[PDB]
Enzyme design. Structure first.
Site, PDB file in Angstrom:
ATOM      1  N   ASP A 228      -9.550  18.990  20.995  1.00  0.00           N
ATOM      2  CA  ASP A 228      -8.785  17.810  22.108  1.00  0.00           C
ATOM      3  C   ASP A 228      -9.739  16.340  21.716  1.00  0.00           C
ATOM      4  O   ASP A 228      -9.096  15.614  21.814  1.00  0.00           O
ATOM      5  CB  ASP A 228      -8.764  18.186  23.318  1.00  0.00           C
ATOM      6  CG  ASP A 228      -7.967  19.198  23.891  1.00  0.00           C
ATOM      7  OD1 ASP A 228      -6.649  19.884  22.809  1.00  0.00           O
ATOM      8  OD2 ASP A 228      -7.493  19.942  24.673  1.00  0.00           O
TER       9      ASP A 228
ATOM     10  N   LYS B  12     -21.245  16.743  31.308  1.00  0.00           N
ATOM     11  CA  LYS B  12     -21.408  18.114  31.961  1.00  0.00           C
ATOM     12  C   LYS B  12     -20.356  18.893  32.275  1.00  0.00           C
ATOM     13  O   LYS B  12     -20.424  20.136  31.954  1.00  0.00           O
ATOM     14  CB  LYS B  12     -22.044  17.445  33.611  1.00  0.00           C
ATOM     15  CG  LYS B  12     -22.601  19.236  34.339  1.00  0.00           C
ATOM     16  CD  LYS B  12     -23.177  18.754  35.208  1.00  0.00           C
ATOM     17  CE  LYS B  12     -23.953  20.103  36.204  1.00  0.00           C
ATOM     18  NZ  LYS B  12     -22.491  20.965  36.138  1.00  0.00           N
TER      19      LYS B  12
ATOM     20  N   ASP C  38     -20.330   5.262  41.716  1.00  0.00           N
ATOM     21  CA  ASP C  38     -20.343   5.034  40.471  1.00  0.00           C
ATOM     22  C   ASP C  38     -19.586   4.674  40.298  1.00  0.00           C
ATOM     23  O   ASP C  38     -20.045   3.502  38.465  1.00  0.00           O
ATOM     24  CB  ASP C  38     -20.997   6.648  39.460  1.00  0.00           C
ATOM     25  CG  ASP C  38     -21.897   7.165  40.633  1.00  0.00           C
ATOM     26  OD1 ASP C  38     -23.449   6.168  41.058  1.00  0.00           O
ATOM     27  OD2 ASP C  38     -22.279   8.200  39.879  1.00  0.00           O
TER      28      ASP C  38
ATOM     29  N   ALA D  50     -22.081  13.420  34.315  1.00  0.00           N
ATOM     30  CA  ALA D  50     -20.311  13.377  34.279  1.00  0.00           C
ATOM     31  C   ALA D  50     -19.747  13.768  33.494  1.00  0.00           C
ATOM     32  O   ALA D  50     -19.595  14.923  33.244  1.00  0.00           O
ATOM     33  CB  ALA D  50     -20.266  11.376  33.757  1.00  0.00           C
TER      34      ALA D  50
ATOM     35  N   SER E 153     -27.726   9.095  30.893  1.00  0.00           N
ATOM     36  CA  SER E 153     -27.673   9.207  32.439  1.00  0.00           C
ATOM     37  C   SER E 153     -26.439   9.523  32.150  1.00  0.00           C
ATOM     38  O   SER E 153     -25.797   9.920  33.969  1.00  0.00           O
ATOM     39  CB  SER E 153     -27.841   7.784  32.527  1.00  0.00           C
ATOM     40  OG  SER E 153     -27.076   6.688  32.464  1.00  0.00           O
TER      41      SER E 153
ATOM     42  N   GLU F 161     -20.355   7.035  28.829  1.00  0.00           N
ATOM     43  CA  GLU F 161     -19.850   8.169  28.069  1.00  0.00           C
ATOM     44  C   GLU F 161     -19.058   7.756  26.893  1.00  0.00           C
ATOM     45  O   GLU F 161     -18.719   6.545  27.782  1.00  0.00           O
ATOM     46  CB  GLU F 161     -19.331   9.622  27.837  1.00  0.00           C
ATOM     47  CG  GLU F 161     -18.214  10.042  29.215  1.00  0.00           C
ATOM     48  CD  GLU F 161     -18.003   8.797  30.138  1.00  0.00           C
ATOM     49  OE1 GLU F 161     -19.258   9.505  30.718  1.00  0.00           O
ATOM     50  OE2 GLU F 161     -17.356   8.026  30.460  1.00  0.00           O
TER      51      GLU F 161
HETATM   52  N1  LIG Z   1     -23.179   9.056  35.946  1.00  0.00           N
HETATM   53  C1  LIG Z   1     -22.937  10.091  36.464  1.00  0.00           C
HETATM   54  N2  LIG Z   1     -23.712  11.131  36.808  1.00  0.00           N
HETATM   55  C2  LIG Z   1     -22.624  12.315  37.492  1.00  0.00           C
HETATM   56  N3  LIG Z   1     -21.227  11.847  37.630  1.00  0.00           N
HETATM   57  C3  LIG Z   1     -20.515  10.836  37.517  1.00  0.00           C
HETATM   58  C4  LIG Z   1     -21.517   9.778  37.131  1.00  0.00           C
HETATM   59  N4  LIG Z   1     -21.300   8.875  36.456  1.00  0.00           N
HETATM   60  C5  LIG Z   1     -19.177   9.255  37.266  1.00  0.00           C
HETATM   61  C6  LIG Z   1     -18.024   8.186  38.523  1.00  0.00           C
HETATM   62  C7  LIG Z   1     -17.301   7.019  38.012  1.00  0.00           C
HETATM   63  C8  LIG Z   1     -15.716   6.580  38.024  1.00  0.00           C
HETATM   64  O1  LIG Z   1     -15.607   6.623  37.168  1.00  0.00           O
HETATM   65  N5  LIG Z   1     -19.703  10.022  37.931  1.00  0.00           N
HETATM   66  C9  LIG Z   1     -18.382  11.056  38.751  1.00  0.00           C
HETATM   67  C10 LIG Z   1     -18.904  11.043  40.103  1.00  0.00           C
HETATM   68  C11 LIG Z   1     -17.463  11.229  41.099  1.00  0.00           C
HETATM   69  C12 LIG Z   1     -16.456  10.989  40.445  1.00  0.00           C
HETATM   70  C13 LIG Z   1     -16.539  11.916  38.719  1.00  0.00           C
HETATM   71  O2  LIG Z   1     -17.348  10.948  37.790  1.00  0.00           O
END
Ligand SMILES: Nc1ncnc2c1nc(C#CCO)n2[C@H]1CCCCO1
Ligand SMILES: Nc1ncnc2c1nc(C#CCO)n2[C@H]1CCCCO1
Ligand SMILES: Nc1ncnc2c1nc(C#CCO)n2[C@H]1CCCCO1
Ligand SMILES: Nc1ncnc2c1nc(C#CCO)n2[C@H]1CCCCO1
Lengths: 262, 262, 262, 262
Positions: free
Chosen positions: B148, B163, B45, B160, B156, B121
């Site tokens: 903080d 969550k 990603d 990330a 979408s 985000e």
């Molecule tokens: N849209 C997303 N939905 C769920 N997870 C996400 C998403 N985008 C990213 C990212 C990135 C790189 O900056 N990640 C996770 C991937 C594993 C490492 C931590 O971030």
């Protein structure tokens, strides 16, 4: 127009109701609690909830108004002092509509499928034993939930029990529903998503029993024990609730007033 | 069509990129990394995020595809084994669009307002000192936040960083944004809403400094120190990101696969 | 006895300090800010924190007192109106002791191990990049943490930053420390415990880097960038902080007053 | 020594029980399920819980052992393959003790005060109506709780229902109890602490009804409806449960194995 007024039943709300009726007598307004077009609730959100379910088969013919004789409610959001000015403007308004949640309960042979409409939320718990259900999203098996239960919330219900379970607050203009968990069991063998889930229109969330088929299902205030359940289905209702709007009271200000300060 | 392929840079993704280019050579496809119409990302990603921001001024002219050479990504959701079958169908598809988040940063005299587009985000933290901001919703003062920082998430992006902060997961068909708190201070004198907030299209969330005007603002991966800030404005973008769709991979299944099991 | 008074620096606290000094002049009390036996803080918990770290090498020789010129503090829990009655009783008391947290930072060749004492908490974040550490408990590898960072809290610190991260409030009579997570990443491949962890005396919690060896470490207010870190070790300190007790002010009432109502 | 073995009741646990009995027949061991000194549980934590409450009036005369025929339990933490080696060493050990939670239920005239011992936790919910109780800590009125209910947990119970409610995990060497909230109602008029609370030995937490006096009280697995309740009192029990220790199985490793990976 035809109208009716429901009261919390205490002294303050009964007199307020009697005064508004007398005020309505000075206009072309007919009291009718069978086919009203304007339904006024005087009490709290509980009184408004009862008024909603009392007339939930004529939602497209009714505009609701709530007066809070106690603290500010999310549905009863007009002070008793505005009652007289409220009678006048009701007599001569705009309408705003909030989405609703539909719950479908299916059973085995002997009982017909029953459907319920919720303004706040619909929750499922077990009846005595442990709560275990398979959560199915648009026929896709998403997770096996173990815990106390699940809560599916309307947008305007997100400030109620949904909020207490860690759910998000959604502006009621968003046609959606929100599923929250109640004390999920999560270890190496049992896995839930944990996070709240927000579903758009036309997504069907389906709870399917794995062992016990008896669940305590609560729609808003009412809690029923359902037996021999085969499926519980959640989706955004096609019906909407209509509010008579007599001033700007933004939802985010209503949230601020109820939770931050007033 | 014009196309380009970006790679994570490791050996696995570079060879995969070279093989797809060779496969594309067998069709009427022109490699162009200046004005492509199809942008393919090979990596994770993070690689897809870089491809998005690389071409964010031609979002209405581009359909993205992600290939995950590591674990399943939410944007790179096709396995390397599908690359050949992906070359063929790209050559001869439907498009699905996800909403984006717009961040506007305003400053005092000397610097012009800067705007950023986020696919995941946009977060705000302090620079050294304590983070205190007034949160304003459609010009209504909602709360004074101490903590903080704050995170505003796209739909979408809810899987990330949103969550991890207790936010809800929203299906990307819902045109909205979600604000979450980072370690709120709540006592008898300091009050935040605590719950995540979900905003529809056209609601403007505005952060206004109370003392320090220096903030660390992060849009997706990129984090910038902004100085002498007068306002930070969040709203659902009018622009949307377009994905080339070559099979049904439902968002809720993508969530299940990434968090429950695969 | 020897004594000294530290002030927040504003007008209210400086005059209060000058009046108590004048009151102390009417008794056998010697002002000494080098080897005091009674240390009085006038301001907030931040002023008290500075007074603690100012004299943290004579903790067994000092009894602290805090006066809050603003809102009620957890350490500065006496009102300015009690200052005169406080001078009298200080002149002629019991002592109560709270546990402290010890942080040990080890580096590669070139830098010696450094140890810090915390009254509230000790946190670790990354420096720019992602925060990934292996969490080791009494030499047992417990988890690999990915997220914003970790916070280890004293019992009296549980009402401070620990509380904002979802930690539990512990009565300060319990000799323990509490580790909380900051925005954990949890999916199918990354797993943290999620829950706060409470450790007894003599349990050593050890953070070990996996890639980046640069961390921003904060002990109470002070935040330092440490470079080339090989290990961060947490344990309940053998040293304790001593408070002069002049009335019953139960911790749970202090919690009630600060968070419920006063 | 005198000993007895309880079984989950399924085929796997009954045969295991019969084999260990036969193995014990080869030693100076007398089966006695009235006054045993060694109590062995074969099943899961539920089977061990039943064995505990079966003999809770001779806790100072009994050392427990749990064998898990399913997944790893926190109390049944020995694999069935170790049964034979377990028979031998039981025949020829050290003891470790975990703290327990005492619940006292007081009623109006007609019913005597009843006390219960919990190994995991004791919870209170309402019976039908809303749950509202005044929370009193060492006779100090701390808060008025409105919500689904409250959970008071032992240290070894912190990995069970306490964990699902956001509670902290405490090492069982800490003589304490932990109170957690179940879906607290928090707005401008209703206030709870929100955070979990950890209490040391000799602190008495007292729940006092405000309207309804009927509560559903659950001690470990058992849930009873109590009527006309005047007070519910929680405190760390003076009694402790004793485990026979035949190898080092650290609590934090038991936590790692059950929640992180094994
Ligand atoms: N849209 C997303 N939905 C769920 N997870 C996400 C998403 N985008 C990213 C990212 C990135 C790189 O900056 N990640 C996770 C991937 C594993 C490492 C931590 O971030
Ligand atoms: N829509 C709502 N948004 C926020 N709060 C709500 C909402 N509805 C109700 C209700 C009710 C009666 O069943 N309440 C609160 C009022 C105070 C007592 C607890 O419930
Ligand atoms: N021990 C504590 N328990 C609860 N709250 C605490 C504690 N210490 C501090 C502090 C400080 C200055 O660094 N604070 C709060 C005071 C209000 C501003 C935020 O920090
Ligand atoms: N002490 C405990 N620590 C962590 N987990 C626990 C504990 N006790 C029990 C139990 C039980 C039967 O009532 N459980 C889990 C086992 C899986 C089913 C849910 O309960």
């Amino acid at each position: 127009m035809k109208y009716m007024i429901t009261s919390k039943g205490d002294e303050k709300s009964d007199l307020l109701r009697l005064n508004m009726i007398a005020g309505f007598g000075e206009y072309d307004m007919e009291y009718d609690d069978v086919e009203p077009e304007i339904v006024i609730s005087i009490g709290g959100d509980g009184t408004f909830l009862s008024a909603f379910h009392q007339y939930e088969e004529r939602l497209d013919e009714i505009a609701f108004i709530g007066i809070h004789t106690g603290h500010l409610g999310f549905y009863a959001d007009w002070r008793p002092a505005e009652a007289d000015k409220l009678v006048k403007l009701l007599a001569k308004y705009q309408k705003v509509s909030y989405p609703l949640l539909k719950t479908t309960v299916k059973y085995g042979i002997g009982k017909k499928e029953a459907t319920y409409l919720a303004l706040n939320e619909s929750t499922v718990k077990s009846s005595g034993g442990p709560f275990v259900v398979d959560v199915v999203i648009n026929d896709i098996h998403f997770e096996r939930f173990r815990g106390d239960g699940l809560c599916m919330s309307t947008p305007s219900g997100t400030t109620a029990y949904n909020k207490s379970l860690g759910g998000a607050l959604m502006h009621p203009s968003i046609e959606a529903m929100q599923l929250t968990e109640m004390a999920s069991i999560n270890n190496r063998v049992y896995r839930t998503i944990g996070s709240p889930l927000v579903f758009p229109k036309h997504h069907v969330v389906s709870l399917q029993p794995v062992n016990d088929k008896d669940f305590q299902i609560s729609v808003d205030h009412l809690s029923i024990l359902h037996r021999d359940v085969q499926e519980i289905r959640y989706e955004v209702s096609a019906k909407k609730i209509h509010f008579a709007r007599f001033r700007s009271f933004p939802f985010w200000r209503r949230v601020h007033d109820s939770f931050i300060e007033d």
